[PDB]
Amino acid sequence: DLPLDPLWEFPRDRLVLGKPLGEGGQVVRAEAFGMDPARPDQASTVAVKMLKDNASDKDLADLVSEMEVMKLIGRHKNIINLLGVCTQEGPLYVIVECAAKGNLREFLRARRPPGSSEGPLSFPVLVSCAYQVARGMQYLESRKCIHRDLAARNVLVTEDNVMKIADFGLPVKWMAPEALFDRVYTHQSDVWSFGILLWEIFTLGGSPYPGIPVEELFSLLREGHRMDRPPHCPPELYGLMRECWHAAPSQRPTFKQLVEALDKVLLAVS
Ligand SMILES: *CCC(=O)Nc1cccc(F)c1Nc1ncc(OCc2c(Cl)c(OC)cc(OC)c2Cl)cn1
Known part of the structure; x- marks a missing residue:
């Protein structure tokens, strides 16, 4: 009514x-x-x-x-x-x-080349995806929105391959420490999830912490361990993942900084 x-x-x-x-x-x-x-x-x-x-x-x-x-x-x-x-x-x-092409996990998974061969998603297209997600989060952040569940499954893809963050107005492997243990969500906790999202992208929709069972994760993090650089992922990108996965939230980059960093890489093609 x-x-x-x-x-x-x-x-x-x-x-x-x-x-x-x-x-x-x-x-x-x-x-x-x-x-x-x-x-x-x-x-x-x-x-x-x-x-x-x-x-x-x-x-x-x-x-x-x-x-x-x-x-x-x-x-x-x-x-x-x-x-x-x-x-x-x-x-x-x-x-x-x-969004015509559905979510980002499935978009990337359906575009995995067979074995060691080269696939239709170039490095710039993948950095572009990541940059677009970073811009969307920067915007939502600027409007005081904490997503809480950023992940490739929650980004959708248009016909013109534009990333669009979903379900922003309302998953242990995506959650920051402080969110997991203390039930505290912030922009910085979203940054942690973006790192995980980044790894999803550069694995063409990989399952984070492959092997590791959910109950054994919380301790791997406490010991200072993080996912390894995925195959063919350049170290500039891997480094961002890792900066996103710092345990101190204030030591993680901001979405602003993520957008600039990703921008540099995209400018640095040609
Ligand atoms: C449009 C063509 C189509 O069928 N697309 C499609 C197929 C399969 C999966 C898939 F995700 C999509 N695209 C798509 N699905 C759902 C949405 O919107 C869902 C949605 C809704 Cl209904 C809201 O309502 C309050 C809010 C949000 O987040 C803001 C979302 Cl994502 C869009 N595209």
């Missing part, structure tokens, strides 16, 4: 629902008509979150929360953006961008 926000209300009759992308609440693919009000006939493919009939007063407040948080954070090329909402005379729909 909700207010009508004229900046975001989109007509429910202009949103043709399609194939479900996820159940668990649910998320549905949809063709929206005139998300660009420049060309109001033009169709675009979008995603839509909504509640299932099996859902409490609480679940509604969460979806309202995420919606409202997304309005407040605002727009950036490197996050999944809010596009509109449907709040009146019918169920809550939160409408957002739909």
Whole structure:
């Protein structure tokens, strides 16, 4: 039973629902008509979150929360953006961008060359992915958003291969020490996760701490151990991973610094 926000209300009759992308609440693919009000006939493919009939007063407040948080954070090329909402005379729909090529883990895994051969993702394309994620996090950070669960599974990829951070408005191998032990999340804890994300990228969607069982990880970290440089990963990049994986959060680089460092590498191609 909700207010009508004229900046975001989109007509429910202009949103043709399609194939479900996820159940668990649910998320549905949809063709929206005139998300660009420049060309109001033009169709675009979008995603839509909504509640299932099996859902409490609480679940509604969460979806309202995420919606409202997304309005407040605002727009950036490197996050999944809010596009509109449907709040009146019918169920809550939160409408957002739909990334054509799915999440970043699966994008990279489906692009692994066989064995020692060379694959379609060049080094610059991979550093580019990492830079784009860094820019998105820098932006979310500048809007006081702590992600808490940054990982390749939570970055999505557009048709034009643009990284878009997902689920920012609401996993032990991705978590910083202070988050694991002390249940403390900060921007710096997101930085730790970005390091892990970096290793994911340069392993084409590798499973972090390969071998090591989850219960034996917390002690490997305490001893000062970290993942090894992956094969073919240059040391400038490996070094960033490692700076992200410092135990003291203040000793980790900021997202600003991550963006600059990654920028240097991309400038240093040609
Ligand atoms: C658009 C074409 C398509 O089918 N894409 C697709 C296939 C398989 C996996 C996959 F991730 C995608 N792309 C995609 N899925 C979901 C979303 O948006 C989910 C989402 C929703 Cl519904 C929010 O609603 C509040 C919020 C956020 O985070 C901000 C996300 Cl990621 C986008 N793209």
